[PDB]
Recover the amino acids of this structure.
């Protein structure tokens, strides 16, 4: 597979999905230890956050926020705390072509600190943002 598409934190990466007839852009930036208290969530480690923006380039897009993950370089993975409580969380609402949607996503970091964000759809890694 030609996936994943890799680039830098702070950059917007484009993915074309012709099965869904959509094109979207995702920006991920500002991955960092958070002071957010999520919850009613059972946090085991330290809450981390990133700021994510989805861009509906072609078609209406419903962002697949549950696909996000924070990772270390060797590959330890922390699932997004999709959606749920979390302050100023990105909306999961569908956005029409030409609009964008932004907000925070959170992670429960229980090991080494992450430096990477990756979107994975259960089948493979699609988009990766690294230093």
């Amino acid at each position: 597979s030609a996936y994943p598409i890799t680039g830098k934190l702070g950059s917007e990466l484009t993915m074309t999905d012709t099965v869904g007839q959509v094109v979207l852009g995702w920006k991920v930036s500002d991955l960092k230890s958070s002071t957010a208290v999520i919850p009613g969530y059972p946090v085991a480690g330290q809450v981390w956050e990133a700021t994510a923006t989805v861009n509906a380039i072609r078609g209406s897009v419903t962002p697949a926020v549950s696909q996000f993950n924070a990772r270390t370089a060797d590959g330890i993975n922390y699932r997004v705390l999709w959606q749920a409580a979390g302050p100023d969380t990105i909306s999961g609402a569908t956005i029409p072509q030409g609009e964008q949607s932004t907000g925070k996503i959170y992670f429960d970091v229980t090991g080494p600190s992450p430096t990477i964000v990756a979107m994975n759809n259960g089948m493979e890694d699609l988009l990766i943002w690294e230093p």
Q: What stands out?
A: The beta strands are 5-8, 12-17, 22-33, 46-58, 68-71, 77-79, 100-109, 116-120, 125-130. The chain has one domain: 1-131. The longest strand covers residues 46-58. The CA atoms of residues 47 and 110 lie 9 Å apart.
